[PDB]
């Protein structure tokens, strides 16, 4: 291949595949000189393929934040929402709306905010002393030492299923989403509870993208160059949020070691499950591209909804706020 990611994947697929067979990959940290003789172009790219590309390898990032008793008692679902360090009128708006944790029928939920680290060598302003006061309150915060970008997020998937099979490997459901979607938790939990129990064993939902390839458009945000990744990508679920079995997290964090880490987080989950021989499934009440405007103030538009991108952290509560009463009028 020409592609650098393809071609590297292909030597992964070698390494763990003796049959295909007729420098850790996983551990070395430092900066991988030989990306710049490699890729046609390599000076030329912008900064951020340029650190995705030298410090591919690096993965064994440890926790600086923890919460290793959350799932002390057995969780039904796990909320995982993708947070960065100054949001935090996004993650308290989640925390008194859809993300509050619960028990109602011994059904738990619990919660808890993945963050990198914003250091100050990209010019972020020094918040660390507000995120261990909030850390401390809240006590659903964790946070790694990586440095948390756009095309780091790959990376906070694998280290957020590390936390799952170490701390939290018992819960029966996992929601992983943005923090700036709503989620209509209560139509999540009866959806979980109307499954069947094979169903159930091998669930993943969402707004799910079938014969998608690489935005070429270099104004795009997920623009991709061809010198990177050619081909089309497998089946993956976008756009906000995806929903889970903590069965398949286990086997999904087992197989990250045999995938390349890739740019988009979500193409990469979409990698995982094609090697597990999954595909994800389709559920379309993850509304990713919102919902008609002349029914924006209904609240009925939110009842059997899923997910809806996106919302500012009023809107969550406001429309949680409506949603409490809905089955009174919808
Ligand atoms: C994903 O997160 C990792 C970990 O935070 C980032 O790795 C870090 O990348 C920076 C550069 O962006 C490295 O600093 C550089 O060090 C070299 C000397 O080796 C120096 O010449 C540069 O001026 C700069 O100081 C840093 O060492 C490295 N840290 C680790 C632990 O590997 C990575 O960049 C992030 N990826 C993306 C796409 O943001
Ligand atoms: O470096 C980043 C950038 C994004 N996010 C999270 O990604 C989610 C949504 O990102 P965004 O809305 O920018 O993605 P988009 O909707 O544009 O595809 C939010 O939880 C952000 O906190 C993150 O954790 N680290
Ligand atoms: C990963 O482990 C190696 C040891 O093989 C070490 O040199 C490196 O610094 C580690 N990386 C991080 C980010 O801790
Ligand atoms: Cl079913
Ligand atoms: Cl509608
Ligand atoms: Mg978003």
Known sequence: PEAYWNREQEKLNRQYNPILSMISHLNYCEPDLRVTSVVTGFNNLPDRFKDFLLYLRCRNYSLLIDQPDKCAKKPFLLLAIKSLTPHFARRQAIRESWGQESNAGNQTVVRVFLLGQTPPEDNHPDLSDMLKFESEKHQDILM??????????????????????????????????????????????????????????????????????????????????????????????????????????????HITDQVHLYPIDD????????????????????????????????????????????????????????????HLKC
């Open 144 to 253: 790694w030492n990586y440095r948390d970008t756009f095309f780091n997020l790959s990376l906070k998937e694998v280290l957020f299923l590390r936390w799952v099979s170490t701390s939290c490997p018992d819960t029966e459901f996992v929601f992983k989403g943005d923090d700036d979607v709503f989620v209509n938790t209560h139509h999540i939990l009866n959806y979980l509870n109307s499954l069947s129990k094979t169903k159930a064993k091998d669930l993943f939902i969402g707004d799910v993208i079938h014969n998608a390839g690489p935005h070429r458009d270099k104004k795009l945000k997920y623009y991709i160059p061809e010198v990177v990744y050619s081909g089309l990508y497998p089946p993956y679920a976008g756009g906000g949020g995806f929903l889970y079995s903590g069965h398949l997290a286990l086997r999904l964090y």
């Open 267 to 326: 193409v990469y989950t979409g990698m995982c499950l094609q090697k597990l021989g999954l595909v994800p499934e389709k559920h379309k009440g993850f509304r990713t591209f919102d919902i008609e405007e002349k029914n924006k103030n209904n609240i009925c538009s939110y009842v059997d909804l899923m997910l809806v991108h996106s919302r500012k952290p009023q809107e969550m509560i406001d429309i949680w706020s409506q949603l409490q009463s809905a």
